[PDB]
RNA sequence: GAAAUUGUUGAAAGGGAAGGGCAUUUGAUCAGAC
RNA sequence: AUGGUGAACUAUGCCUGAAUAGGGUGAAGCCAGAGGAAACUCUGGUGGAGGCUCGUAGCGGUUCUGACGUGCAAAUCGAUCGUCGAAUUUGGGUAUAGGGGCGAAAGACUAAUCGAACCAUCUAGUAGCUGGUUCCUGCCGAAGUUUCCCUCAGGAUAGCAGAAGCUCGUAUCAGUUUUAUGAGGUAAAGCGAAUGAUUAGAGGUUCCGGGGUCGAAAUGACCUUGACCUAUUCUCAAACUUU
RNA sequence: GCCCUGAAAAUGGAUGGCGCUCAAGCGUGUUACCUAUACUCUACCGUCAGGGUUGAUAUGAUGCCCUGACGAGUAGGCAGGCGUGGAGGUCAGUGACGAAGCCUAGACCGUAAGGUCGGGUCGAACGGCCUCUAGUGCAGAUCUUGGUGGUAGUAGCAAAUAUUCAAAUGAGAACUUUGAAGACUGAAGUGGGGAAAGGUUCCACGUCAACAGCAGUUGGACGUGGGUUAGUCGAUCCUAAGA
RNA sequence: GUGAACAGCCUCUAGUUGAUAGAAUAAUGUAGAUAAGGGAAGUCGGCAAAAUAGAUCCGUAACUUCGGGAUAAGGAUUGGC
RNA sequence: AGAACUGGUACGGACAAGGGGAAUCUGACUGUCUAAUUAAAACAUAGCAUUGCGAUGGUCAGAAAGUGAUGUUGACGCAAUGUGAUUUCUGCCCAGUGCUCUGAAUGUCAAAGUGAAGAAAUUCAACCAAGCGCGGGUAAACGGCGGGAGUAACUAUGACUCUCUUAAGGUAGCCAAAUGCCUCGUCAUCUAAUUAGUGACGCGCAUGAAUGGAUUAACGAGAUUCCCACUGUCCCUAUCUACUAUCUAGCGAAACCACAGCCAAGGGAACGGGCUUGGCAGAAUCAGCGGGGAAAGAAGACCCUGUUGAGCUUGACUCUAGU
RNA sequence: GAAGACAUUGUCAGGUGGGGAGUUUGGCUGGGGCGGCACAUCUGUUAAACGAUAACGCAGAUGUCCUAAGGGGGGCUCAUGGAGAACAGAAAUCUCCAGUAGAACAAAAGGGUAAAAGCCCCCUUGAUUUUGAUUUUCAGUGUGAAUACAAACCAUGAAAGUGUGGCCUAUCGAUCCUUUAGUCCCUCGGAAUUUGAGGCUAGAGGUGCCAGAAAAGUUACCACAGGGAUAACUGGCUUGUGGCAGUCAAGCGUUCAUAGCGACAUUGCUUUUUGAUUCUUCGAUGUCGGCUCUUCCUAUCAUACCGAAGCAGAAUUCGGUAAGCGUUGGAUUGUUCACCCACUAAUAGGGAACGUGAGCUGGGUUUAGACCGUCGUGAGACAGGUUAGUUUUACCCUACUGAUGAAUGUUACCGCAAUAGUAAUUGAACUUAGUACGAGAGGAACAGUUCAUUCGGAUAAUUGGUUUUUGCGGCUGUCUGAUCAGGCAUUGCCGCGAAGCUACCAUCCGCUGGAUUAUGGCUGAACGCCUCUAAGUCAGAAUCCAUGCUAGAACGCGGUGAUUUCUUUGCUCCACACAAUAUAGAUGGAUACGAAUAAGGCGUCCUUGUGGCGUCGCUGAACCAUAGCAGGCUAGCAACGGUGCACUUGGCGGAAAGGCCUUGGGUGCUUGCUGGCGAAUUGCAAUGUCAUUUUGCGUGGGGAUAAAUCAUUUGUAUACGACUUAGA
């Protein structure tokens, strides 16, 4: 017999299975479509989630109640030092999908990048690209052939970059390596662009520009094993239920004499890879720029880092991207920032966002002051002071 | 000093049972006859 | 059915013991005072009654239909709860014994056993009902049908089957055809044939159907309706039929 | 005539499936080819039937031989055989130079029941044949008694607030002893005595195979012993309900 | 000792420190709890839980077998010195 | 008992410790019972009422007895019943089934005893105890309280009158009550909305007087309705603690088990793990889970059958203790 | 003292006697009960032309009736119609004609019957006596009925003859007992007589459950052996009924059959009603409802796009593609159902063992307690009402959710993408616009903007919740002599309280291309016209497939880095040296345009094309290769070609290129032609061994000198594994 009353099902069936991701760095499964008319540019970037903070800005949209009037807003800061270009890969178009024809690497690789190729770095002769470096030191013999291989073939060209994880306060010491597809033109000069950028850093301002919609790709915060009530949002069973109430009462009919794949059940929650879209960049901060957190309306010399530092992350001495809202992943997590895959006017994505005030109060409590100078003025002199 | 049941060694087979029948290949072993 | 054993659990009586904070309320009896046309009424003390009451120990066992539910436990555990000075609680002694006890009465309890305890014997109690019923090969090979039965899940009986054969040796034979001779009432057919049913008009007769017209009426006449008769017409029958 | 509309049901799915469009569909016709335990021939087995052959030697005349036909089977009937315990007869049978039993993807016979042999183990009895006799053959009866698995190194060993440090002993210490620290019962006690009941559980010494669902050097365990002193405390006497 | 109290809580005498332990802190359980705004809409049903609660002062209805109802209902106070 | 002062308005500071109100049904109350699914409206109870009996007795026990209980008793008692405090009331019916009384009896009637016939066994006849039958009493015995006809000046109805069955015809009260089918009865009230609730209306299938009727303060771990307060019951969930579950050392079971364990459809004992046609199909596994294994727990307690029972009842059949 | 031969005591007899005892309280049967009798029977039919033949199949009948309605005989002819007669008519009685039964013969019906079998008159008991045979049913038993006889005694009639009950087919009863008639016989057993009794043959009393016990209920306190031979769930066959849908078109609709409806008929579908049945299940598949959750169907309520109107607008009605997406909060009731209140775009219908009880609950139903009404004498009964009433077990397999993991030389990093899944949804306000339209009333829509509902995925800056941060403070009781500082009160209590977790109770985000359905069109035949259709084709829906999003096949794949010698000489590549290993199956060559097939291939020519001319196919049965000891050893001739082999020059090919072409020289052979030598004996065939897979051990010649795991450690992770970090 039918349900006596209707209700939408709990949870989304397109995000199945709710298993753990295969890696801590979510993979980019689609890059922006290429038109061979623009200059050569990276389409993505690698950064670390620093934390949340609060922004005040003047909303500008006609027809709204809050037009030309203040709105307090929530943003998240992603810490983005420049990425070092080491290597390039060509992809031939085959009837069985794209396939990497060959990889050409740079002559010199730092320590922090070659640590990626090791499980035990403290036990090593460290033997990394030692015989590959001998491919260089010739005039024009070796490297140019595989480079010309990517010229003659490989309709898709991607660039291997590694993050400067030593500049961030993270205690990892082991960089993150990824392919970022080049979406310039004339794949021959895509290969040329990667050639003279070997061992050279690409800053975030050359990829993302302020007031842009970008994509955040990261692995979500994990919560271990979860009951069905929280994992799927099912209704809680009544109080006087024998043998538990954080369950699903009927997990199937008599026929088919099986449990279907679509019935909510207990298991892993979180640590999924997600691609959230349409996040607007509110600031492209400069690492070597005092008063990162300042604004034309504030004009007070203060960096983006709140008093006491970003909770569980540290400080933002490097460049950063301030993007509106919330993104998948927790603090200290590697996050990939991707360009929008389509063009949207939307009367909301073309708005020019000009900040007015950035919150720098402590996130380690009910923060009261924005700067140590502000705290000293309000309170006065203390007994600690001499 | 049996069987169920068990250990060790040896041999063989095993993609959601195993076991069986006809026929033969292959491997192991063997009687007769000269 | 016979003969025994149990009131160490529990039921009720009797005998002899034993146990039961601290509060609330404030009955009779008693003292003093006040108002008083008397009569009498009122007030404050005192006192400490009640199968009274809140609530411990105790005795109990309402709800969570909680825990447990191959338990700690063949009835327990937690919380909540009833009663708590007596128709109270309880020990020991003793009385009551199975168609019998005891019962503030639930068919309750009478040793985890009760709408008739337990033990042994009669007793291998009876069952048209359930289950099982042990080696091989060869040859043959059924029935669910008849009649009777308090007969319908059973028997008896005939039949179907096997075995032993017996007397004879191709015949007093045959789940067949032919010839000759009978019997039958089904299929079909039939209703201008009996019975019954059933459509339509045509022609006739009323001293004797009902009506309208000319008539006082006529066994007077005219038009119509009903039956009646004749020759037709359409359609039928398991309990209709010549064939 | 074919095709289409008419033509709506619940897990995904059924010309058997793939798939097939002058078909690999439908109607129709003509040949070729495939294959049943069916039909023809042959061999072999048994059963039934009809016959031949005592003649001397050689023993089964219930024997040997010739001919023909036939063979499914539940319940059931009949017949011929295999095996077991024991008894009469006989093989002047086998055997401590190894009987019986047990084990053996080694050999042989029989359609089969079964029979025989070889090898290992073992240690004292046992068979062939003709007969006699029966407590004579198992896969099952929620069969009886005994034994053993998968489950499975699994459920579990979570009520009662709580342990820690060090030394001693020992093969071995979370658990024994001692010290120290931290706690609890909180006087209707986790204290000190008894009644009923138990019977040595009391105490010492030695001691850990078993029991204390971990452990164990410890124990209400195990082995060996010691220990209960009345004129006054009880019984002993009286009587009660009763016997 | 607190306190009306052989209540509940703490301590003295006396006696125990007995119940397999160790490591982590997933889901779901058992037991104990707290929740913004709403306040029975939940459910057969307020089942469960919550609220009230000691004492002192004030005040106390219908009805009544005149004994009760009654701690009715409803207010105030509460430490230390 | 009172007064100052004092504090982050706190102070029965932990512990301890009534939620309250308006109503309906029902039992008066306290008390008792189904040990181990029912604590109740059940039982008890006081009070009320009835019945039997003066001892050669009532009631009861016993195989029997020179036997017993009440009884060491004596109607202000003993035995047997019904109802169930108080208040109020307990209406009509003795035809029936009972029970109980007169016996004034051509009714019936045993054994014995008597008479006649007989040759006797025997047959016949009259007579005849208790009992039945006949005739009275009794309902706080068991119980019952129905039709019909004619009538009042609008109809309707019947204060009045008569009549059968079979004796009487339901009075005082109470009711969609725990007793009403129809029924979710109709009206009012309560709600935004009520098959609930309360108050009313009645030819009431089938209310009703110690089968007790009605009312009723107090009480109730009894059934029900609503209001205030209060809250995680809920909107709609979230978080925390202990012990588990989890991993380890030691110790270490049970249920159950034809063989086993992937589906779809088909056909099939009409719902397959196995069969057919398909889809498929990769070792070894861990924590969860409750779809399935028509999972497990019991030779269905329901139904039916059986010439199988038992407990109980009675104008069943056949007997019997006692009297 | 009382009583007194009465009580009492003993035996026999009558009444009373559920206090007690034992027992019984039919059968068939579309389950049982109620009902009925299909139980003993009879007629017609079913019944299918001998006989037989079932059903609780159809129309009925019997437990009797008759001294004549039995037996014999004689005479007459019936029902009815027509015509006539005083009262007298449709029915009185009388006359004639007609009249095959259309009457009667007890009853039920069917046969039969006309000088009778009918109606009237006469006589009588043949409805008698004796035992046998036979038919029916059948067992060739009994019982009943009957048939024809034999031996007596009669009736009637002139006589022939008829008469052994009823014109035929129903109309009935064993054993034991009692009783009667007959025989007046046998026996009473030590011998007699007489009563009495027992025997012998024929009747009567009766069993209707009728081949034949002597028999009341109840059980909700219950028991046993069984039954799925038999009911109450599901499921299966069926579909009357329920529900849904068609065809026809008399009519309604002012007018007008079909805008919307639609009578009388009729044809279907479904299994969400209820029936009918009894196949499975009674050594048990847990029978209401709700809650929870998933999925499926379409007969579509809303949302998308459309067609038709009795569509001016608005609102609405009919219909199509469509199940992508939604379909609620409540009062009462256990309720399913129902009925109201209210919101909403809408509050559609259903299935999944009437889904879902080792998921819950337990309000209802349906054990045992209890009350009432009604019924019963009673025990008790009631699909009447009411109140209280134990809801057990997963640790196994599979499924599902998550999680590891051997083996693909090792190890590490970066990737591809087969397959599977998928997602967004709906409303409001402003403007368009008081506009279009309409006499007026009234009154839209596309485009645009701002928000909101339902859903989903994350996240913690802020706000709120949570407190063992037992972090700070405060307070009570007690304990530590007081102070300070602490313990205990199972987290003592209270206020605040960071971090983490977390709330539509907080915030953010949720994409655009193609192909289509219905539908509306273009060109254009069929059908000289016309037509959206046939060929061809355009636009088009919340639809499908893509983009995008999640996982990554643990037996799908690519690129890249490093690859161990003093673990006692290890690893890799190259040449041969010998072994082992195995074969989804060499035995001359897998021999390369593309495109069309109502058209092409090749050759040639020009003015280079969609060109002209010529030729070819009609199968690869082709082309190439192919002679020599399983293919030997030598000689010459002719040309300077052919082939194999190791080197070498230069290119081309990345879809899995791993192969193709080419320059130069050397070398072997050459069957292009002509000579010389050898073969035997494997005995007359025996595959008669000539291929390539992998691995190992040796040489000699180059090439290069790593990691991973455990353990420790971090928390961006976590049940354990696993993950992510760090450590010379
Ligand atoms: Mg005066």
CSV table of N, CA and C (backbone and C1' of nucleotides) in Angstrom, one decimal, chain G residues 40-65:
chain,number,residue,atom,x,y,z
G,40,A,P,-31.2,-44.5,2.9
G,40,A,O5',-32.1,-45.7,3.4
G,40,A,C5',-33.1,-45.5,4.3
G,40,A,C4',-34.4,-46.2,3.9
G,40,A,C3',-34.7,-46.1,2.5
G,40,A,O3',-34.1,-47.1,1.7
G,40,A,C1',-36.6,-45.4,3.8
G,41,U,P,-34.0,-47.0,0.1
G,41,U,O5',-35.5,-47.3,-0.4
G,41,U,C5',-36.0,-46.5,-1.5
G,41,U,C4',-37.5,-46.3,-1.3
G,41,U,C3',-38.3,-45.8,-2.5
G,41,U,O3',-38.6,-46.9,-3.4
G,41,U,C1',-38.9,-44.5,-0.6
G,42,C,P,-38.3,-46.8,-4.9
G,42,C,O5',-39.5,-45.9,-5.5
G,42,C,C5',-40.7,-46.5,-5.8
G,42,C,C4',-41.8,-45.4,-6.1
G,42,C,C3',-41.6,-44.7,-7.3
G,42,C,O3',-42.0,-45.4,-8.5
G,42,C,C1',-42.2,-43.2,-5.6
G,43,U,P,-41.3,-45.1,-9.9
G,43,U,O5',-42.0,-43.8,-10.5
G,43,U,C5',-43.3,-43.8,-10.8
G,43,U,C4',-43.7,-42.4,-11.5
G,43,U,C3',-42.8,-41.9,-12.5
G,43,U,O3',-43.0,-42.5,-13.8
G,43,U,C1',-43.4,-40.2,-11.0
G,44,G,P,-41.8,-42.5,-14.9
G,44,G,O5',-41.7,-41.0,-15.3
G,44,G,C5',-42.6,-40.4,-16.3
G,44,G,C4',-42.3,-39.0,-16.4
G,44,G,C3',-40.9,-38.6,-16.9
G,44,G,O3',-40.7,-38.8,-18.3
G,44,G,C1',-41.5,-37.2,-15.1
G,45,U,P,-39.2,-39.2,-18.8
G,45,U,O5',-38.3,-37.9,-18.5
G,45,U,C5',-38.6,-36.7,-19.1
G,45,U,C4',-37.7,-35.5,-18.6
G,45,U,C3',-36.2,-35.7,-18.7
G,45,U,O3',-35.7,-35.5,-20.0
G,45,U,C1',-36.8,-34.9,-16.6
G,46,U,P,-34.4,-36.2,-20.5
G,46,U,O5',-33.2,-35.5,-19.6
G,46,U,C5',-32.9,-34.1,-19.9
G,46,U,C4',-32.1,-33.5,-18.8
G,46,U,C3',-30.7,-34.1,-18.6
G,46,U,O3',-29.8,-33.5,-19.5
G,46,U,C1',-31.7,-34.0,-16.5
G,47,A,P,-28.6,-34.3,-20.1
G,47,A,O5',-29.1,-35.8,-20.2
G,47,A,C5',-28.8,-36.6,-21.3
G,47,A,C4',-29.5,-38.0,-21.1
G,47,A,C3',-31.0,-38.0,-21.0
G,47,A,O3',-31.4,-39.3,-21.6
G,47,A,C1',-30.1,-39.0,-19.1
G,48,A,P,-31.7,-39.4,-23.2
G,48,A,O5',-30.2,-39.3,-23.8
G,48,A,C5',-29.9,-38.3,-24.8
G,48,A,C4',-28.5,-38.2,-25.2
G,48,A,C3',-27.7,-39.6,-25.3
G,48,A,O3',-28.0,-40.2,-26.5
G,48,A,C1',-26.4,-37.9,-24.2
G,49,A,P,-28.3,-41.7,-26.7
G,49,A,O5',-29.8,-41.8,-27.2
G,49,A,C5',-30.9,-41.7,-26.3
G,49,A,C4',-32.0,-42.7,-26.7
G,49,A,C3',-31.5,-44.1,-26.9
G,49,A,O3',-31.2,-44.9,-25.7
G,49,A,C1',-32.9,-43.5,-28.7
G,50,C,P,-30.0,-45.9,-25.7
G,50,C,O5',-30.6,-47.2,-25.1
G,50,C,C5',-31.8,-47.8,-25.6
G,50,C,C4',-32.1,-49.1,-25.0
G,50,C,C3',-32.0,-49.2,-23.5
G,50,C,O3',-33.1,-48.7,-22.8
G,50,C,C1',-30.9,-51.0,-24.4
G,51,G,P,-33.0,-47.8,-21.4
G,51,G,O5',-32.1,-48.8,-20.5
G,51,G,C5',-32.7,-49.9,-19.9
G,51,G,C4',-31.7,-50.7,-19.2
G,51,G,C3',-31.0,-50.0,-18.1
G,51,G,O3',-31.7,-50.0,-16.9
G,51,G,C1',-29.4,-51.1,-19.4
G,52,A,P,-31.9,-48.6,-16.1
G,52,A,O5',-30.4,-48.3,-15.5
G,52,A,C5',-29.8,-49.2,-14.6
G,52,A,C4',-28.3,-48.8,-14.4
G,52,A,C3',-28.1,-47.4,-14.0
G,52,A,O3',-28.2,-47.2,-12.6
G,52,A,C1',-26.7,-48.0,-15.8
G,53,U,P,-29.1,-46.1,-12.0
G,53,U,O5',-28.1,-44.9,-11.6
G,53,U,C5',-26.7,-45.2,-11.5
G,53,U,C4',-25.9,-44.1,-12.1
G,53,U,C3',-26.4,-42.7,-12.1
G,53,U,O3',-26.2,-42.1,-10.9
G,53,U,C1',-25.6,-43.1,-14.3
G,54,A,P,-27.4,-41.5,-10.0
G,54,A,O5',-26.7,-40.5,-9.0
G,54,A,C5',-25.4,-40.7,-8.5
G,54,A,C4',-24.5,-39.5,-8.5
G,54,A,C3',-25.2,-38.2,-8.0
G,54,A,O3',-25.1,-38.1,-6.6
G,54,A,C1',-24.1,-37.8,-10.1
G,55,A,P,-26.3,-37.5,-5.8
G,55,A,O5',-26.1,-35.9,-5.9
G,55,A,C5',-24.9,-35.3,-5.5
G,55,A,C4',-24.9,-33.9,-5.9
G,55,A,C3',-26.2,-33.1,-5.8
G,55,A,O3',-26.4,-32.6,-4.4
G,55,A,C1',-25.3,-32.6,-7.9
G,56,C,P,-27.0,-33.6,-3.3
G,56,C,O5',-28.0,-32.6,-2.5
G,56,C,C5',-29.1,-32.0,-3.1
G,56,C,C4',-29.2,-30.6,-2.9
G,56,C,C3',-27.9,-29.8,-3.4
G,56,C,O3',-28.3,-28.5,-3.9
G,56,C,C1',-28.3,-29.3,-1.1
G,57,G,P,-27.7,-28.0,-5.3
G,57,G,O5',-27.8,-29.3,-6.3
G,57,G,C5',-29.1,-29.7,-6.7
G,57,G,C4',-29.5,-29.3,-8.1
G,57,G,C3',-30.9,-29.1,-8.4
G,57,G,O3',-31.4,-27.8,-7.9
G,57,G,C1',-29.9,-30.2,-10.1
G,58,C,P,-33.0,-27.7,-7.4
G,58,C,O5',-33.8,-27.9,-8.8
G,58,C,C5',-34.0,-26.8,-9.7
G,58,C,C4',-35.0,-27.2,-10.8
G,58,C,C3',-36.4,-27.5,-10.4
G,58,C,O3',-37.2,-26.3,-10.2
G,58,C,C1',-35.7,-29.1,-11.9
G,59,A,P,-38.4,-26.3,-9.2
G,59,A,O5',-39.5,-27.3,-10.0
G,59,A,C5',-40.7,-26.8,-10.5
G,59,A,C4',-41.7,-27.8,-10.9
G,59,A,C3',-42.4,-28.5,-9.7
G,59,A,O3',-43.5,-27.8,-9.2
G,59,A,C1',-41.6,-30.2,-11.2
G,60,G,P,-43.5,-27.3,-7.7
G,60,G,O5',-44.4,-28.4,-7.0
G,60,G,C5',-43.8,-29.6,-6.3
G,60,G,C4',-44.4,-30.8,-6.9
G,60,G,C3',-44.8,-31.9,-5.8
G,60,G,O3',-46.1,-31.6,-5.2
G,60,G,C1',-43.6,-32.9,-7.5
G,61,A,P,-46.3,-32.0,-3.6
G,61,A,O5',-46.4,-33.6,-3.6
G,61,A,C5',-47.5,-34.2,-4.2
G,61,A,C4',-47.4,-35.7,-4.2
G,61,A,C3',-47.2,-36.4,-2.8
G,61,A,O3',-48.5,-36.6,-2.2
G,61,A,C1',-45.6,-37.3,-4.3
G,62,U,P,-48.5,-36.8,-0.6
G,62,U,O5',-47.8,-38.2,-0.3
G,62,U,C5',-48.4,-39.4,-0.8
G,62,U,C4',-47.7,-40.6,-0.2
G,62,U,C3',-47.5,-40.7,1.3
G,62,U,O3',-48.7,-41.0,2.0
G,62,U,C1',-45.5,-41.4,0.2
G,63,G,P,-48.8,-40.5,3.5
G,63,G,O5',-48.1,-41.6,4.4
G,63,G,C5',-48.5,-43.0,4.3
G,63,G,C4',-47.8,-43.7,5.4
G,63,G,C3',-48.2,-43.3,6.9
G,63,G,O3',-48.1,-44.4,7.7
G,63,G,C1',-45.9,-43.1,6.5
G,64,U,P,-49.3,-45.5,7.8
G,64,U,O5',-50.6,-44.6,7.8
G,64,U,C5',-51.8,-44.9,7.0
G,64,U,C4',-52.2,-43.6,6.3
G,64,U,C3',-53.7,-43.7,5.8
G,64,U,O3',-54.6,-43.3,6.8
G,64,U,C1',-52.3,-42.9,4.0
G,65,C,P,-56.0,-44.1,6.9
G,65,C,O5',-56.6,-44.0,5.5
G,65,C,C5',-57.2,-42.8,5.0
G,65,C,C4',-57.9,-43.1,3.7
G,65,C,C3',-58.7,-44.3,3.6
G,65,C,O3',-60.1,-44.1,4.1
G,65,C,C1',-57.3,-44.4,1.8
